[PDB]
Amino acid sequence: MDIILGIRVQDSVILASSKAVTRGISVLKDSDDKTRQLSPHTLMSFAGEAGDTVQFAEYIQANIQLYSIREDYELSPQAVSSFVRQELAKSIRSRRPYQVNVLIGGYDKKKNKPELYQIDYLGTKVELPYGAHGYSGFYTFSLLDHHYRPDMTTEEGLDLLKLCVQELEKRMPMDFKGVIVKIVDKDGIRQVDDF
Amino acid sequence: TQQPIVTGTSVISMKYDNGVIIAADNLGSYGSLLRFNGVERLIPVGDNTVVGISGDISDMQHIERLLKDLVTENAYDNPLADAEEALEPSYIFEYLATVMYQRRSKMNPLWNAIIVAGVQSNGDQFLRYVNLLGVTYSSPTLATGFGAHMANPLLRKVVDRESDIPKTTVQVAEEAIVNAMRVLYYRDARSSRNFSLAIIDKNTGLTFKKNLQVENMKWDFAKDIKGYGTQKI
């Protein structure tokens, strides 16, 4: 289970993604970044079947970067999420579907609002204040149902996220080797190097 | 991929000093039902080759047509079609063997086991086997199906190796073949009494014998057999 979490607060979106890469019986890596920057104010985390995850993320990344150059303009998070959903919805009826679940965290510079989209491999899109894929949600959703507010600061969002990770580290059976946390706001995307 | 429906049983053959003999019964079975009783499973090609086929009869009839068409095609723009550039047993066999292996490789086989018997231009005897898998082999004696299990042992008593071939006459070889066909009628539940036999000699040419019967059978001892153990009456 490749833990990926997302929380949308007052003025930013925070994505947390596990660092472990386990192939069979061995943890091959403990510092893996399960995310790609699609545009300066849009970040996508991902989790699913080996190989497909990165292949899909980079394919989406390339397409959005192509759009940015062509139009000299950044697509809204809503527009990017719809593009991503259609690709997955197309994929599910293919010969060999992309087995990838994603979270898309973005800051809309037009509306001055943070936005978080949860999309599964079937192409099921939902906009949420907080989201998760896989078994992580079974612990974190109910925890966030209790501790979340729409007017929270970024620092409060990080403390709230630490509470999620602590619970996961206590009750989940796999050692996912901690998480890489990234914040998406009006100034762009930055990584929290100490977590 | 399919399953065979109307089938032909053993085809047996052997080399002798001046040529080759091949035989096969005239039955077309439909599972346990002995449905067709007048089926010719030896198909001559020219006056120097006989193809004996076992297995699926519908596929046999398809092969029969390929060979008929092969003769037609070889005659085209060929003034030496009845002489130097006539069809040889080796040509006919390799053609079939090519087809059989191609069909198995497409997973749509011709459900047969084939023996091409004949005599070459230089008088050399030709006897080679090919089946639905494209598997090929040659031997002084060749047999398909039940014949492989019961006929080969009898025919190998006559020609156990290559050096025994010049020592074997046509009368001795035909006698062995006819005996083997009787044994198969005793023991193969999908065989018939009626059969066809063909001889390809380098001197006397192709002799095709039809409407042969298994004769001189031993059954009298059956009367003395009573019960399955303890039954005296």
Partner: protein, 204 residues
């Protein structure tokens, strides 16, 4: 495994006197896990309303598809599409995927702008039209909805009464289904006004 019951959800539609009503729950889940409580299953193309239950990706996909087709219809025909015509468009569109179907249970609702006649219809996942006078049901609690609608419904109800009947049909059916609930929305539709109400229901 069964695509039609992974996400869960329900839709119901009713006719009244010079009015129609269509309602849906708000849940979206992954089997036992509840994910979203804001997943509306009713859409509208002009004055024609469409509710869709089943696999959520197909629900979203079909909405986008019928928005596409109705927008072109309008540009060419120079008029909005009517419920009877839209119903045939849905049936056509679903049957063209006969051997690779969308796992959905659509429900059309609306009033003919010319005749003023109320109209509802339902479909199976491959196109078969169920044009009923009284009511149409769809979803994981369709059995429950059939029982509530068949007992509570009576013809020629006024808008404000029809609201109560359809709301109670939905609510009590949803409460007997594990995969339905988490909120509900009801549309009351008249020839030239449409009211949308969010219902207060138990959140379990």
């Amino acid at each position: 495994s069964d695509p039609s019951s992974i996400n869960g959800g329900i839709v119901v539609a009713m006719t009244g006197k010079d009015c129609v009503a269509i309602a849906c729950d708000l849940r979206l889940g992954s089997q036992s896990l509840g994910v979203s409580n804001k997943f509306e299953k009713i859409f509208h193309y002009g004055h024609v309303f469409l509710g869709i239950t089943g696999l959520a990706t197909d629900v979203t996909t079909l909405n986008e598809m019928f928005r596409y087709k109705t927008n072109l219809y309008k540009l060419k025909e120079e008029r909005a599409i009517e419920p009877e015509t839209f119903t045939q468009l849905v049936s056509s569109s679903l049957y063209e995927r006969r051997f690779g179907p969308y796992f959905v249970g659509p429900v059309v609702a609306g009033i003919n702008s010319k005749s003023g006649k109320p109209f509802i219809a339902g479909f199976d996942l491959i196109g078969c039209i169920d044009e009923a006078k009284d009511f149409i049901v769809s979803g994981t609690a369709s059995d429950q909805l059939f029982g509530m609608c068949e007992s509570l419904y009576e013809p020629n109800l006024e808008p404000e009464d029809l609201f109560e009947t359809i709301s109670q049909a939905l609510l009590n059916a949803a409460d007997r289904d594990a995969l339905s609930g988490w909120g509900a929305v009801v549309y009351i539709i008249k020839k030239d006004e449409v009211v949308k109400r969010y219902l207060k229901m138990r959140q379990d």
